[PDB]
């Protein structure tokens, strides 16, 4: 079950300055980037074109290129329409893409946030506000929904293009997606012990402090933190009495280890 996310971040500081940057994720692996500085979308994997021919890619890129320039003018123009009520600076975020299920099934989505709050989505054949959205957005929605050609294009993007493209990506990027990277662990202290686990992929991992073969239930795992090389980092801590560290061990289970767990005794 993989989620494909196209993420757009647009900042408008005033009437005459904006930037738009995008990144694209398939699960927890980046497949594209698109800087404001670049006229073209950059592949961050060798398989980022998926199963699209070069002609299909160019057509798709070209639609995005037009979108980015148009989007920019449209926001600026919507701001003129609502003022003095709404005004700069403005942050807009888009999250679009699809979630792939087994056997030709998928749900596509297009969610828009305004100043950090989810306010609008594309649903069915039109834009709509979601619950909690301020009512002044009804005018922008009404204007956006007037554009029949954008609607038809977005519909085709969500319904047909996203799932097709992503099915091809899963095939082309199989060996990067199904990779197995081993965690390396190490210990340290500050009383509070720390078991550092780093270098593992995929994300599912089990880490627990133990005496012999007894799970120490005071174990607090922290967040999953990324490494620069597309592997993960996690630290599992444990509060203990000074002097009472004899026979404590850190056990780590991960799919890459193939049964041979890592056990580190203090």
């Amino acid at each position: 079950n993989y989620t494909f996310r196209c993420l757009q971040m647009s900042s408008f500081a005033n009437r005459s300055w904006s930037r738009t940057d995008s990144v694209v994720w398939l699960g927890d692996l980046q497949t594209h980037r698109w800087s404001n500085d670049s006229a073209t979308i950059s592949f961050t994997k060798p398989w980022s074109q998926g199963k699209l021919s070069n002609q299909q890619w160019e057509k798709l890129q070209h639609m995005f290129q037009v979108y980015r320039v148009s989007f920019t003018r449209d926001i600026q123009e919507l701001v003129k329409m609502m003022s003095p009520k709404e005004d700069y600076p403005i942050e807009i975020q888009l999250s679009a893409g699809c979630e792939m299920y087994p056997g030709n099934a998928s749900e596509s989505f297009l969610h828009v946030a305004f100043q950090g709050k989810y306010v609008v989505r594309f649903w069915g054949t039109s834009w709509q506000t979601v619950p909690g959205a301020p009512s002044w957005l009804d005018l922008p929605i009404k204007v956006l929904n007037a554009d029949q050609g954008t609607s038809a294009t977005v519909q085709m993007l969500l319904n047909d293009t996203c799932p097709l493209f992503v099915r091809g990506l899963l095939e082309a990027g199989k060996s990067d997606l199904e990779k197995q990277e081993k965690p390396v662990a190490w210990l340290s202290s500050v009383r509070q012990l720390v078991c550092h686990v780093s270098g593992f992929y995929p994300k599912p991992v089990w880490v627990m402090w133990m005496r012999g073969d007894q799970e120490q239930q005071g174990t607090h795992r922290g967040d999953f933190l990324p490494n620069a090389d597309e592997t993960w980092y996690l630290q599992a801590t444990l509060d203990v009495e000074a002097g009472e560290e004899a026979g404590l061990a850190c056990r780590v289970k991960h799919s890459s280890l193939g049964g041979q767990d890592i056990i580190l005794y203090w």
Epitope: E77, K80, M81, S83, Q148
Partner: T-cell receptor, first 113, second 111 residues
């Protein structure tokens, strides 16, 4: 100037057909409208073309649009004296009020009766 | 959807004040002022998304705009010059792309 019209002017005799060209560089190109303007008068819409490869008709006027080539033609069949006017091509860059219109400078037609 | 313009025709002196008015009873939020000059297509001067709003178009220099109400959109030339001799068209529209044009206003600015 992102909208260009050819010919700039032409003279034809009553009953003859003629073809008026519009070429543009406007991006994006949601739709194209053809206007008729009599001398001293205002803008009367003749037709609006919206599809990638579109065709329209309105009596003796017919038109085509190809968005790949960014090209439109207005055909007037069997000209009459009252077709003496300037014909104007307009490209709209959005399917909403957020669009700007990009106007050609027009083609002057004279029909000799 | 009908739009009206007044005056329809106007002779003015350099340095004088000229006001061109446009009235529209369609309840359209959006209004637009253009000028037409030989060898050019219509060019946008000012526009408005509603009462109190005015926006600069492509060639706003020498013109002030005014949107006192939904119905009325005015083009004000405070210090009229001969370069403002032209035919001025007003238009209105709702959220759709169609603009509905008024019949035009001839302006001559004499020295």
């Amino acid at each position: 100037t992102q909208v260009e019209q050819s010919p700039q002017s032409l003279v034809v005799r009553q009953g003859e057909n003629c073809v008026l060209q519009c070429n543009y560089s406007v991006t994006p190109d949601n739709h194209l409208r053809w206007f008729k303007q009599d001398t001293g008068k205002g803008l009367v819409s003749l037709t609006v073309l919206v599809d990638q490869k579109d065709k329209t008709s309105n009596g003796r006027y017919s038109a085509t649009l190809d968005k790949d080539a960014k090209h439109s033609t207005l055909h007037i069949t069997a000209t009459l004296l009252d077709d003496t006017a300037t014909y104007i091509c307009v490209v709209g860059d959005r399917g909403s009020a957020l669009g700007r219109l990009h106007f050609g400078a027009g083609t002057q037609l004279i029909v000799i009766p | 959807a009908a739009v009206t313009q007044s005056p329809r025709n106007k002779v003015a002196v350099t340095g004088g004040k000229v006001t061109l008015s446009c009235n529209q009873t369609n309840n359209h939020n959006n209004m637009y002022w253009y000028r037409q000059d030989t060898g050019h297509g219509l060019r946008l001067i000012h526009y408005s998304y509603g009462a109190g709003s005015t926006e600069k178009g492509d060639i706003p220099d020498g013109y002030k705009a005014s949107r006192p109400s939904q119905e009325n959109f005015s083009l004000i030339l405070e210090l009229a010059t001969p370069s403002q001799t032209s035919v001025y068209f007003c238009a209105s529209g709702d959220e759709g792309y169609t603009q509905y044009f008024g019949p035009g206003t001839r302006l001559l600015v004499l020295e």
